[PDB]
Amino acid sequence: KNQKVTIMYYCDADNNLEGSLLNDIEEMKTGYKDSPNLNLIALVDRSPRYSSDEKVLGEDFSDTRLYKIEHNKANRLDGKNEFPEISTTSKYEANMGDPEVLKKFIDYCKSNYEADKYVLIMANHGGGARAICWDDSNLDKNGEADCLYMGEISDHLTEKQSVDLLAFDACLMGTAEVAYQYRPGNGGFSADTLVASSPVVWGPGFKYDKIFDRIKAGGGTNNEDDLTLGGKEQNFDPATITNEQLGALFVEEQRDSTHANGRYDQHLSFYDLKKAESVKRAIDNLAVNLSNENKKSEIEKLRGSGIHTDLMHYFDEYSEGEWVEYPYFDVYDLCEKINKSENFSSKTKDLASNAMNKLNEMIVYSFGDPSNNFKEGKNGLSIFLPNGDKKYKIPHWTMQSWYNSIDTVKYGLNPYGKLSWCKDGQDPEINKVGNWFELLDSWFDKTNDVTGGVNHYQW
| Binding map of Na ion across residues 255-274, x = CB under 5 A, - = no contact | -x------------------
Q: How many residues bind Na ion (CB under 5 A)?
A: 12
Is the CB of 224 or the CB of 293 nearer to Na ion?
A: 224
425 contacts Na ion (rule: CB under 5 A): no
Q: Which of 5, 8, 9, 14 binds Na ion (CB under 5 A)?
A: 14
445 contacts Na ion (rule: CB under 5 A): yes
Per CB under 5 A, which region of 177-185, 253-261, 358-366, 430-438 contacts Na ion?
A: 253-261
Is the CB of 248 or the CB of 282 nearer to Na ion?
A: 248
Is the CB of 380 or the CB of 453 nearer to Na ion?
A: 453
Residue in the shown chain whose Cβ atom is closest to Na ion: 453
Is the CB of 135 or the CB of 237 nearer to Na ion?
A: 135
327 contacts Na ion (rule: CB under 5 A): no
The catalytic residue positions are 171
Output the 3-class SS for the chain: CCCCEEEEEEEECCCCCHHHHHHHHHHHHHHCCCCCCEEEEEEEECCCCCCCCCCCCCCCCCCEEEEEEECCEEEECCCCCCCCCCCCCCCCCCCCCCHHHHHHHHHHHHHHCCCCEEEEEEECCECCCCCEEEEEEEECCCCCEEEECHHHHHHHCCHHHCEEEEEEECCCCCEHHHHHHCCCCCCCCCEEEEEECCCCCCCCCCCHHHHHHCCCCCCCEEEEECCCCCCEEECCCCCCCCHHHHHHHHHHHHHHHHHHCCCCCCCEEEEEHHHHHHHHHHHHHHHHHHHHCCCHHHHHHHHCECCECCCCECCCCCCHHHHHHCCEEEHHHHHHHHHHCCCCCHHHHHHHHHHHHHHHHHEEEEECCHHHCCCCCCCCCEEECCCCCCECCCECHHHHCCCCCCCHHHHCCCCCCCCHHHHCCCCCCCCCCCCHHHHHHHHHCCCCCCCCCCCCCCC
Q: How far is the CB of 44 from Na ion (least distance, A)?
A: 10
452 contacts Na ion (rule: CB under 5 A): yes
Q: How far is the CB of 245 from Na ion (least distance, A)?
A: 15
Is the CB of 63 or the CB of 317 nearer to Na ion?
A: 63
Is the CB of 255 or the CB of 313 nearer to Na ion?
A: 255
137 contacts Na ion (rule: CB under 5 A): yes
| Binding map of Na ion across residues 189-228, x = CB under 5 A, - = no contact | -----------------------------------x----
Q: Which residues from 365-384 bind Na ion, rule CB under 5 A?
A: none
45 contacts Na ion (rule: CB under 5 A): yes
Tell me which residues touch Na ion (CB under 5 A): 14, 45, 135, 137, 224, 256, 441, 445, 452-453, 455, 457
